[PDB]
């Protein structure tokens, strides 16, 4: 019975597989999107599974919106790393759109666009997506 009581999300957030997702109503740059999610006790979305990627990408592909995710190459090595410190894994490289990542022109931040991901300049104003765990409590 406990699973059924562990699906609580804030209003205007979407539940998927144990987490809650917020799609913003306005646009900010990448770093300000990181901070926006922190302010609501969440994180600019870090994708952990293919199923999660498919869920998120489907919301994007319908919308024609560009949305920041919690992924950048902002480190000494210049490697793609999620904001929780985890590296971008080999099996997720299939999610970049054709032509991406450019890995040039300081396109250091990742965004959802269409059926996949782009790298883009971090000063661009995009929508953003936050993720936080769903809450467990009685009803
Ligand atoms: Ca790019």
Curated annotation (Swiss-Prot):
It comes from the Eukaryota. GO terms for biological process: adaptive immune response; antigen processing and presentation; cell-cell recognition; immune response; innate immune response; intracellular signal transduction; intracellular transport of virus; leukocyte cell-cell adhesion. GO terms for cellular component: cytoplasm; external side of plasma membrane; extracellular region; host cell; membrane; plasma membrane. The keyword Repeat applies. Homotetramer. (Microbial infection) Interacts with ebola virus glycoprotein. Residues 15-131 form the C-type lectin domain. This is C-type lectin domain family 4 member M. It comes from Homo sapiens. Predominantly highly expressed in liver sinusoidal endothelial cells and in lymph node. Found in placental endothelium but not in macrophages. Expressed in type II alveolar cells and lung endothelial cells. In vitro, is a receptor for HIV-1 and transmits HIV-1 to permissive T-cells. Probable pathogen-recognition receptor involved in peripheral immune surveillance in liver. May mediate the endocytosis of pathogens which are subsequently degraded in lysosomal compartments. Is a receptor for ICAM3, probably by binding to mannose-like carbohydrates. Glycans are attached at residue 102. The tandem repeat domain, also called neck domain, mediates oligomerization. The keyword Membrane applies. Keywords: Adaptive immunity, Calcium, Cell membrane, Disulfide bond, Endocytosis, Glycoprotein, Host cell receptor for virus entry, Host-virus interaction, Immunity, Innate immunity, Lectin, Mannose-binding, Membrane, Metal-binding, Receptor, Repeat, Secreted, Signal-anchor, Transmembrane, Transmembrane helix. GO terms for molecular function: calcium-dependent protein binding; carbohydrate binding; D-mannose binding; ICAM-3 receptor activity; metal ion binding; pattern recognition receptor activity; peptide antigen binding; signaling receptor activity. Disulfide bonds join 6-136, 9-20, 37-130, 109-122. Ca(2+) binds at residues 100, 102, 104, 107, 118-119.
């Amino acid at each position: 019975a406990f699973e059924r009581l562990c699906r609580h999300c804030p209003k205007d957030w979407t539940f998927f597989q144990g987490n809650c997702y917020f799609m913003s109503n306005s646009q900010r740059n990448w770093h300000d999107s990181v901070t926006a999610c922190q302010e609501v006790r969440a994180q600019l979305v870090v994708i952990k599974t293919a199923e999660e990627q498919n869920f998120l990408q489907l919301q994007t592909s319908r919308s024609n919106r560009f949305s920041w995710m919690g992924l950048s190459d902002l480190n000494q090595e210049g490697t793609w790393q999620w904001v929780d410190g985890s590296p971008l894994s080999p099996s997720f490289q299939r999610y970049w759109n054709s032509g991406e990542p450019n890995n040039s022109g300081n396109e250091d931040c990742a965004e959802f666009s269409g059926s996949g991901w782009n790298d883009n300049r971090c000063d661009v104003d995009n929508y953003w997506i936050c993720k936080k765990p769903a809450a467990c409590f009685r009803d």
